[PDB]
Amino acid sequence: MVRGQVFDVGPRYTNLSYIGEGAYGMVCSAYDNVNKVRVAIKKISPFEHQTYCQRTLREIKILLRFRHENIIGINDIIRAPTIEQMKDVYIVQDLMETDLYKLLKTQHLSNDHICYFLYQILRGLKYIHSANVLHRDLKPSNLLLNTTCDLKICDFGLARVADLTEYVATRWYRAPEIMLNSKGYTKSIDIWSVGCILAEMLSNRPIFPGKHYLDQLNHILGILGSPSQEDLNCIINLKARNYLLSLPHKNKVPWNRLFPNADSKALDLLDKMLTFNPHKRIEVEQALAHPYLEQYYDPSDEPIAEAPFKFELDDLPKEKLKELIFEETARFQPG
Ligand SMILES: CCCn1cc(-c2c[nH]c3ncc(-c4ccncc4)nc23)cn1
Q1: What SS3 state is found at 242?
Q2: Are 320 and 142 in contact (CB under 8 A)?
Q3: Domains identified in the chain and CATH numbers
Q4: Of 274, 267, 269, which Cα lies nearest the Cα of 297?
Q5: In the record, which positions carry Phosphotyrosine?
Q6: How far apart are the C-alpha atoms of 177 and 191, rounded to whole Å?
Q7: Cβ(194) – ligand 1 distance below 6 Å
Q8: Do the annotations mark residue 225 as ligand-binding?
């Protein structure tokens, strides 16, 4: 019933309107008749593939456990009464106005707006990391905003407990560790992504675009300068590490040269987030306490996860995952 595709969510949810489609599934807005408000609904069809089943169950488990102002919640979940009839899952969430991707594509943000958006991203990230979770895919299109500039992080399908390469729409926010296929990356990958997002808010253009990870790395080296051997002490492809060390030397571009109109405090924080070496990268608590954010900083108002996360699903056959998804969504069935 939308774009020639079945969106079977009535009778509670009616007046459907298309929002978007992508790897995450298809998202519409709908009128919730029980709550008398419009909501967002994501349709997902994961049961054929083992990795989609993983991500679906992971997203559901995480978001049902999380509760934070700057993290999207799950309001309801629609699926068939029988596991045999279940082919699709519809996840109902708060309807926001837009995402940061669309906002940045056409709108200018004042420094005060950039400051408040970044605070909310980091405040949410603090909660996620406190739950021992890596998001792993932060980017402008999964930062949702409403009219009053409130921000929520969504899209936790790629998330993981903190102890690829499928298709993705964009790789521009991925830390160097990730796209050098390093094994043993940590929370600091999310800080890199946030740094990339901050840069994009400052200029309305991606800081490290590129057609493949090699082109992206050239962009990164073109700004940060050549990496030392210590920057590359991870377990990574030796030929890839050797290629990087072999490139013509690049000097660091001063941040104020790239961003001549930015707040100097913003750029000082930006610098600490976009450090090549992940060990030297600022952590989220320190970032929140940076002078750039001091007008918003409040440790008594930056909650952490009550029950930090402990699940493994990697090893499970999809039919066992399907079962677990069926069980996890049972509480939302009438009744
Ligand atoms: C890659 C993330 C896909 N995703 C978006 C949502 C979502 C939940 N509530 C929303 N409210 C509004 C919008 C939205 C976005 C753009 N333009 C308009 C409206 N999106 C959502 C969930 N998953």
Answers
A1: helix
A2: no
A3: 1-95+317-334 (3.30.200.20), 96-316 (1.10.510.10)
A4: 269
A5: 167
A6: 12
A7: no
A8: no
Cα 315 to Cα 48, 53, 165, 171, 197, distances in angstroms: 16, 12, 18, 26, 34
- Cβ neighbours of residue 118 under 8 Å, at least 6 residues apart? 194, 197, 198, 201, 269, 292, 293
Ligand 1 contact via 42 beta carbon (within 6 Å): yes
In 3D space, the residue among 331, 264, 250, 324 whose CA is nearest the CA of residue 59 turns out to be 324
Q: Has 24 been labeled as part of a binding site?
A: yes
- Is 266 close to ligand 1, i.e. is its CB under 6 Å away? no
Method: X-ray
**Structure tokens that stand for 258 in this block:** 């790239």
Residue 161 forms beta bridges with which residues?
A: 133
Across 156-169, b (16+ Cβ under 10 Å) vs e yields bbbbbebeeeeeee
CB hemisphere CA count around 130 (13 angstroms): 18
Q: Which of these, 185, 117, 126, lies nearest to 152 by C-alpha position?
A: 117
Structure tokens at 68: 């934070």
- The residue type at 104: L
- For 4, phi then psi, to 5°, come to 65, 10
The answer to whether 145 and 103 are in contact (CB under 8 A) is yes
CA atoms within 13 A on the CB side of 66: 30
